[PDB]
Amino acid sequence: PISATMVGALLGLGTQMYSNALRKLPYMRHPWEHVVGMGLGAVFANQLVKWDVKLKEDLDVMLAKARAANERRYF
Amino acid sequence: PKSQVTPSPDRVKWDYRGQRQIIPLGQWLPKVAVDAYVAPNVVLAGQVTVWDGSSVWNGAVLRGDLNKITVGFCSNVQERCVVHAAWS
Ligand SMILES: CCCCCCCCCCC(CCCCCCCCCC)(CO[C@H]1O[C@@H](CO)[C@H](O[C@@H]2O[C@@H](CO)[C@H](O)[C@@H](O)[C@@H]2O)[C@@H](O)[C@@H]1O)CO[C@H]1O[C@@H](CO)[C@H](O[C@@H]2O[C@@H](CO)[C@H](O)[C@@H](O)[C@@H]2O)[C@@H](O)[C@H]1O
Ligand SMILES: CCCCCCCCCCCCCCCCCCCC(=O)O[C@H](COC(=O)CCCCCCCCCCCCCC)COP(=O)(O)OCCN
């Protein structure tokens, strides 16, 4: 399927070549920073997914606390 | 009438560096855009500006020593073209 690693690598390569294009340079000007960008994009995508899971868990906990606080109004 | 010349013993008969393509004249440095193609045989002297998409081809000399020389967007100066500027 579409994993976070591959979408991150594609986004990193795309942003590196987009930066190269924006400066009127050839797309593959410096090949090493393309690899660096692919690695950074993969890392960022994986960290984003890992953070999203924890963020949803914390939101669920906070909403459970809020619902429990509201429910006590009926006593 | 003289008919007399004095050869210099320090004159160089072969420059291993070849001819330098960009020749700055004092504070005038030729400006070449990163998107512009300038052939390795080209000589740019003085204040010469080459813009985006422009191209200068083999054997061309662009001496902007006297006045300014400007090559526009996507405009090309082809092979062995001498572009020079006068005071007035
Ligand atoms: C802008 C580009 C648009 C691309 C998106 C469309 C393409 C679809 C792929 C989107 C994609 C990557 C996100 C890309 C980030 C963008 C890059 C950011 C900039 C980078 C430069 C996330 O997509 C999935 O992520 C899930 C979150 O886990 C979510 O499911 C919801 O979760 C619940 C919440 O708790 C909800 O309650 C519930 O309703 C849903 O179940 C959904 O978002 C979705 O199913 C692909 O999934 C990737 O993440 C996980 C799978 O999870 C995989 O690894 C996981 O790791 C552990 C979990 O940490 C797990 O332990 C492990 O078992 C698992 O293997 C990866 O291998 C890969 O598959
Ligand atoms: C988010 C949607 C997904 C987007 C895709 C994300 C993908 C992950 C990121 C991929 C990045 C790929 C980049 C390839 C690596 C190239 C880095 C080389 C930079 C470098 O060598 O350092 C000097 C400049 O520093 C720099 O260029 C550093 C620039 C950093 C700018 C931002 C700094 C962090 C700010 C915080 C984030 C931005 C705000 C967010 C709210 C270069 O020097 P030189 O040779 O070019 O010449 C002098 C120019 N100065």
Side-chain angles (χ1 to χ4, degrees):
Chain A
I2 301 299
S3 63
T5 287
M6 71 175 68
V7 65
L10 270 294
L11 271 174
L13 173 74
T15 181
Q16 172 46 12
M17 291 175 28
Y18 194 11
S19 169
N20 271 359
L22 271 175
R23 298 192 291 148
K24 303 300 292 295
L25 307 176
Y27 287 118
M28 311 275 318
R29 167 62 85 195
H30 289 341
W32 50 92
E33 45 195 14
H34 289 60
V35 161
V36 168
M38 293 177 70
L40 290 176
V43 169
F44 183 48
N46 279 285
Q47 289 309 311
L48 190 72
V49 176
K50 195 211 82 182
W51 181 50
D52 170 21
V53 169
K54 171 180 63 172
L55 212 62
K56 177 80 196 315
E57 292 169 9
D58 197 20
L59 180 50
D60 273 1
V61 162
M62 298 206 78
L63 265 181
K65 268 165 26 174
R67 274 191 300 81
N70 192 10
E71 197 269 334
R72 284 201 61 280
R73 175 197 299 181
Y74 309 135
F75 315 130
Chain B
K2 211 185 316 301
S3 186
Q4 187 267 340
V5 293
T6 76
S8 180
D10 63 358
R11 176 166 290 285
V12 292
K13 298 179 28 168
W14 164 69
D15 206 347
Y16 82 105
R17 285 160 313 156
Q19 163 79 70
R20 183 170 48 174
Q21 158 188 291
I22 292 282
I23 297 164
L25 293 190
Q27 205 143 20
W28 301 327
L29 179 64
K31 195 263 287 180
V32 183
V34 297
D35 189 359
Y37 162 70
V38 179
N41 209 351
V42 181
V43 169
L44 304 176
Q47 38 188 353
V48 180
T49 298
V50 179
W51 281 105
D52 310 330
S54 163
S55 82
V56 190
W57 296 83
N58 296 306
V61 187
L62 272 72
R63 283 206 289 116
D65 44 11
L66 290 184
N67 217 346
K68 294 202 41 53
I69 302 194
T70 298
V71 190
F73 173 75
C74 279
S75 66
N76 59 296
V77 185
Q78 282 179 48
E79 285 86 9
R80 308 201 60 76
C81 283
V82 191
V83 183
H84 191 244
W87 270 335
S88 51

Short mmCIF file of all heavy atoms in Angstrom, two decimals, chain A residues 8 11-16 19 23 30 32-42 44-45, ligand 2:
data_model
loop_
_atom_site.label_atom_id
_atom_site.label_comp_id
_atom_site.label_asym_id
_atom_site.label_seq_id
_atom_site.Cartn_x
_atom_site.Cartn_y
_atom_site.Cartn_z
N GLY A 8 6.62 10.19 2.24
CA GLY A 8 7.59 11.12 2.77
C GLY A 8 8.80 11.29 1.87
O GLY A 8 9.27 12.41 1.65
N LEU A 11 7.72 13.30 -1.13
CA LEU A 11 7.56 14.70 -0.78
C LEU A 11 8.91 15.38 -0.60
O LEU A 11 9.09 16.54 -1.00
CB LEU A 11 6.72 14.84 0.48
CG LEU A 11 5.21 14.94 0.24
CD1 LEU A 11 4.46 14.92 1.56
CD2 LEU A 11 4.87 16.19 -0.55
N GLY A 12 9.88 14.69 0.01
CA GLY A 12 11.20 15.28 0.17
C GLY A 12 11.91 15.51 -1.16
O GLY A 12 12.50 16.57 -1.38
N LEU A 13 11.86 14.52 -2.05
CA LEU A 13 12.44 14.71 -3.37
C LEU A 13 11.73 15.83 -4.13
O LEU A 13 12.38 16.65 -4.79
CB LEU A 13 12.38 13.40 -4.16
CG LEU A 13 12.80 13.47 -5.63
CD1 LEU A 13 14.30 13.59 -5.74
CD2 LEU A 13 12.31 12.24 -6.37
N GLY A 14 10.41 15.89 -4.01
CA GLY A 14 9.65 16.93 -4.68
C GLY A 14 9.98 18.31 -4.17
O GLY A 14 10.11 19.25 -4.95
N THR A 15 10.14 18.46 -2.85
CA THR A 15 10.46 19.78 -2.32
C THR A 15 11.89 20.18 -2.64
O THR A 15 12.16 21.36 -2.88
CB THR A 15 10.19 19.86 -0.82
OG1 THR A 15 10.50 21.18 -0.35
CG2 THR A 15 11.04 18.88 -0.05
N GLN A 16 12.82 19.22 -2.68
CA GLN A 16 14.18 19.55 -3.10
C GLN A 16 14.20 20.03 -4.55
O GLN A 16 14.82 21.06 -4.88
CB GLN A 16 15.10 18.35 -2.91
CG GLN A 16 16.52 18.50 -3.48
CD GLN A 16 17.22 19.82 -3.17
OE1 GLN A 16 16.78 20.61 -2.34
NE2 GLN A 16 18.32 20.06 -3.87
N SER A 19 12.60 23.45 -4.83
CA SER A 19 13.53 24.50 -4.44
C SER A 19 14.54 24.77 -5.54
O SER A 19 14.87 25.92 -5.82
CB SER A 19 14.25 24.11 -3.15
OG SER A 19 15.34 24.98 -2.90
N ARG A 23 14.88 28.50 -8.02
CA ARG A 23 16.10 29.28 -8.14
C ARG A 23 16.67 29.26 -9.54
O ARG A 23 17.83 29.63 -9.73
CB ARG A 23 17.14 28.79 -7.14
CG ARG A 23 16.71 28.94 -5.69
CD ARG A 23 17.88 28.71 -4.75
NE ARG A 23 18.31 27.32 -4.75
CZ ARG A 23 19.57 26.93 -4.56
NH1 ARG A 23 20.54 27.81 -4.36
NH2 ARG A 23 19.85 25.64 -4.57
N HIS A 30 22.26 19.37 -7.16
CA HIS A 30 23.13 18.67 -6.21
C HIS A 30 22.49 17.34 -5.84
O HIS A 30 21.55 17.31 -5.04
CB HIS A 30 23.36 19.53 -4.96
CG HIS A 30 24.22 20.72 -5.19
ND1 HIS A 30 25.07 20.84 -6.27
CD2 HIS A 30 24.38 21.86 -4.47
CE1 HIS A 30 25.71 22.00 -6.21
NE2 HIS A 30 25.31 22.63 -5.13
N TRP A 32 23.22 14.90 -3.89
CA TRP A 32 23.28 14.40 -2.52
C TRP A 32 22.16 14.98 -1.66
O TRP A 32 21.58 14.27 -0.83
CB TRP A 32 24.65 14.70 -1.90
CG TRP A 32 25.08 16.12 -2.06
CD1 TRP A 32 24.87 17.14 -1.18
CD2 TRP A 32 25.80 16.68 -3.16
NE1 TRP A 32 25.41 18.30 -1.67
CE2 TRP A 32 25.99 18.05 -2.88
CE3 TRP A 32 26.30 16.16 -4.36
CZ2 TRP A 32 26.66 18.90 -3.75
CZ3 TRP A 32 26.96 17.01 -5.22
CH2 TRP A 32 27.14 18.36 -4.91
N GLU A 33 21.84 16.26 -1.84
CA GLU A 33 20.78 16.83 -1.02
C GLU A 33 19.41 16.33 -1.45
O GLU A 33 18.47 16.42 -0.66
CB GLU A 33 20.82 18.36 -1.04
CG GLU A 33 21.01 18.99 -2.39
CD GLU A 33 21.39 20.45 -2.28
OE1 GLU A 33 21.76 20.88 -1.17
OE2 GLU A 33 21.30 21.17 -3.30
N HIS A 34 19.27 15.78 -2.65
CA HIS A 34 18.04 15.08 -2.99
C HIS A 34 17.85 13.85 -2.12
O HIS A 34 16.75 13.60 -1.61
CB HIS A 34 18.04 14.69 -4.47
CG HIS A 34 17.88 15.85 -5.40
ND1 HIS A 34 18.77 16.90 -5.43
CD2 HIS A 34 16.94 16.12 -6.34
CE1 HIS A 34 18.38 17.78 -6.35
NE2 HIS A 34 17.27 17.32 -6.91
N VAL A 35 18.91 13.07 -1.92
CA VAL A 35 18.86 11.92 -1.02
C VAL A 35 18.59 12.38 0.41
O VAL A 35 17.81 11.76 1.14
CB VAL A 35 20.17 11.11 -1.13
CG1 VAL A 35 20.35 10.23 0.09
CG2 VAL A 35 20.18 10.29 -2.40
N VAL A 36 19.25 13.47 0.82
CA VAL A 36 19.02 14.01 2.16
C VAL A 36 17.56 14.41 2.33
O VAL A 36 16.95 14.14 3.37
CB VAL A 36 19.97 15.19 2.42
CG1 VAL A 36 19.55 15.95 3.67
CG2 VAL A 36 21.40 14.70 2.55
N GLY A 37 16.98 15.05 1.31
CA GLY A 37 15.59 15.44 1.39
C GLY A 37 14.64 14.26 1.43
O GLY A 37 13.64 14.28 2.14
N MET A 38 14.95 13.21 0.66
CA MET A 38 14.14 11.99 0.72
C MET A 38 14.16 11.40 2.12
O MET A 38 13.11 11.03 2.67
CB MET A 38 14.64 10.97 -0.30
CG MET A 38 14.45 11.39 -1.74
SD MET A 38 15.13 10.19 -2.90
CE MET A 38 13.98 8.83 -2.70
N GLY A 39 15.34 11.31 2.73
CA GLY A 39 15.44 10.78 4.08
C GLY A 39 14.68 11.63 5.09
O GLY A 39 13.96 11.10 5.94
N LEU A 40 14.84 12.95 5.00
CA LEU A 40 14.15 13.84 5.93
C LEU A 40 12.64 13.76 5.75
O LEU A 40 11.89 13.80 6.74
CB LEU A 40 14.63 15.28 5.76
CG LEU A 40 16.06 15.56 6.22
CD1 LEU A 40 16.45 16.99 5.91
CD2 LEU A 40 16.21 15.27 7.70
N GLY A 41 12.17 13.66 4.51
CA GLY A 41 10.74 13.53 4.28
C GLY A 41 10.18 12.24 4.84
O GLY A 41 9.10 12.23 5.44
N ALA A 42 10.90 11.13 4.66
CA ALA A 42 10.46 9.86 5.23
C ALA A 42 10.39 9.95 6.75
O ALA A 42 9.40 9.52 7.37
CB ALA A 42 11.39 8.73 4.80
N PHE A 44 10.06 12.65 8.61
CA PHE A 44 9.00 13.56 9.03
C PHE A 44 7.62 12.92 8.88
O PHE A 44 6.76 13.10 9.74
CB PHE A 44 9.06 14.85 8.22
CG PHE A 44 8.03 15.87 8.64
CD1 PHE A 44 7.85 16.18 9.98
CD2 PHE A 44 7.24 16.50 7.70
CE1 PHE A 44 6.91 17.11 10.37
CE2 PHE A 44 6.29 17.43 8.08
CZ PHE A 44 6.13 17.74 9.42
N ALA A 45 7.39 12.17 7.80
CA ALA A 45 6.10 11.51 7.63
C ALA A 45 5.87 10.46 8.71
O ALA A 45 4.77 10.37 9.28
CB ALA A 45 6.00 10.90 6.24
C1 LIG C 2 5.08 20.59 5.17
C2 LIG C 2 4.58 19.96 3.87
C3 LIG C 2 5.60 18.94 3.37
C4 LIG C 2 6.80 19.67 2.77
C5 LIG C 2 7.89 18.66 2.44
C6 LIG C 2 8.76 18.42 3.68
C7 LIG C 2 9.87 17.44 3.33
C8 LIG C 2 10.87 17.39 4.49
C9 LIG C 2 11.90 18.51 4.32
C10 LIG C 2 12.75 18.23 3.09
C11 LIG C 2 13.83 19.30 2.96
C12 LIG C 2 14.78 18.93 1.83
C13 LIG C 2 15.92 19.94 1.75
C14 LIG C 2 17.17 19.27 1.20
C15 LIG C 2 18.34 19.52 2.14
C16 LIG C 2 19.06 20.80 1.71
C17 LIG C 2 19.54 21.55 2.95
C18 LIG C 2 20.84 22.28 2.63
C19 LIG C 2 20.81 23.67 3.27
C20 LIG C 2 22.24 24.10 3.59
O1 LIG C 2 23.15 23.45 3.19
O2 LIG C 2 22.48 25.23 4.39
C21 LIG C 2 22.57 26.48 3.75
C22 LIG C 2 21.23 27.21 3.87
O3 LIG C 2 20.50 26.65 4.92
C23 LIG C 2 19.15 26.44 4.61
O4 LIG C 2 18.78 26.53 3.49
C24 LIG C 2 18.15 26.09 5.71
C25 LIG C 2 16.77 26.58 5.28
C26 LIG C 2 15.74 26.25 6.36
C27 LIG C 2 14.55 27.19 6.21
C28 LIG C 2 13.54 26.93 7.33
C29 LIG C 2 14.25 26.85 8.68
C30 LIG C 2 13.31 26.22 9.70
C31 LIG C 2 12.14 27.16 9.96
C32 LIG C 2 11.05 26.43 10.72
C33 LIG C 2 10.11 25.74 9.74
C34 LIG C 2 9.54 26.77 8.76
C35 LIG C 2 8.31 27.44 9.38
C36 LIG C 2 7.26 26.38 9.70
C37 LIG C 2 6.19 26.98 10.61
C38 LIG C 2 22.96 26.36 2.28
O5 LIG C 2 23.73 27.47 1.92
P1 LIG C 2 23.88 27.83 0.32
O6 LIG C 2 24.99 27.01 -0.27
O7 LIG C 2 22.58 27.51 -0.38
O8 LIG C 2 24.21 29.44 0.16
C39 LIG C 2 23.82 30.31 1.18
C40 LIG C 2 22.30 30.36 1.28
N1 LIG C 2 21.93 30.90 2.58
#
